[PDB]
A paper describes a structure:
The RsiG–WhiG cognate pair is the only known example of a σ–anti-σ complex that is targeted by c-di-GMP. Here we show that the same σ–(c-di-GMP)–anti-σ switch has been co-opted during evolution to regulate distinct biological functions in unicellular and filamentous bacteria, controlling type IV pilus production in the genus Rubrobacter and the differentiation of reproductive hyphae into spores in Streptomyces. Moreover, we show that the anti-σ likely originated as a homodimer and evolved to become a monomer through an intragenic duplication event. Structural analyses revealed that these single-motif RsiGs form an antiparallel coiled-coil through homodimerization, enabling them to bind c-di-GMP in the same manner as the monomeric twin-motif RsiGs.
Two well-diffracting crystal forms of the RsiGRr protein were obtained. Crystal form 1 was solved by selenomethionine single-wavelength anomalous diffraction (SAD) and refined to Rwork/Rfree values of 17.3%/20.2% to 1.86-Å resolution. The structure contains six molecules of RsiGRr in the crystallographic asymmetric unit (ASU), which form three essentially identical antiparallel dimers (root mean square deviations of 0.6 Å when comparing Cα atoms of the coiled-coils). Indeed, the structure shows that the single-motif RsiG from R. radiotolerans is homodimeric, with helical residues 45 to 83 forming a tight antiparallel homodimeric coiled-coil with overall structural similarity to the monomeric twin-motif RsiG from S. venezuelae. The formation of the homodimeric RsiGRr coiled-coil buries an extensive 1,904 Å2 of protein surface from solvent. This corresponds to a predicted ΔG solvation free-energy gain upon interface formation of −35 kcal/mol, supporting that the homodimer is the physiological relevant form. The same RsiGRr crystal forms were obtained in the presence of c-di-GMP under identical crystallization conditions, but no nucleotide was visible in the structures. This appears to be due to the presence of Mg2+ ions, which were required for crystallization for both crystal forms. The Mg2+ ions in both apo structures are coordinated by D74, located at the C terminus of the E(X)3S(X)2R(X)3Q(X)3D motif. The tightly coordinated Mg2+ in the RsiGRr structure sterically disallows c-di-GMP binding.
Residue numbers in the entry:
A (entry chain C), B (entry chain B): 23 to 98
The structure:
């Protein structure tokens, strides 16, 4: 447990003016948000790869269940 | 096989060959993965904006607590 120590999200949401934070505090915020950005980017790459494989497999079947634009825009 | 109530992640991990799935099953997978990719892309945009604001605020101070490369790579 955190023992009520503030999370990066809570510090960020509760700060009216960043000028009131120290550089050490700002660097902690930036580090936390940067880590989340990197985790998201890794997961986006996984999702894009799976979508690419699925879309190629649907196209491979040479059917007409879905139109070209439904495939391109993922209108399912 | 039928009415197994599997999640998209479970279907994906448990399918050795996508030719075993119906087009309707592939549609559902594509839709779930596309929705997830859009959801975390939105969150990524938020994280990138917060990082941009924090980095500008540290630069604004005109100090030397952090080097240029430390700021550029978020090394903390
Ligand atoms: Mg900037």
């Amino acid at each position: 447990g955190s023992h009520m120590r503030e999370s990066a999200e809570e510090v960020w949401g509760g700060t009216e003016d960043l000028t009131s934070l120290s550089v050490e505090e700002l660097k902690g915020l930036m580090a936390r948000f940067d880590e989340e950005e990197k985790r998201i980017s890794y997961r986006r790459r996984v999702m894009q790869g799976r979508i690419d494989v699925i879309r190629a497999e649907i196209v491979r079947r040479g059917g007409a269940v879905l139109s070209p634009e439904e495939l391109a825009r993922v209108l399912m």
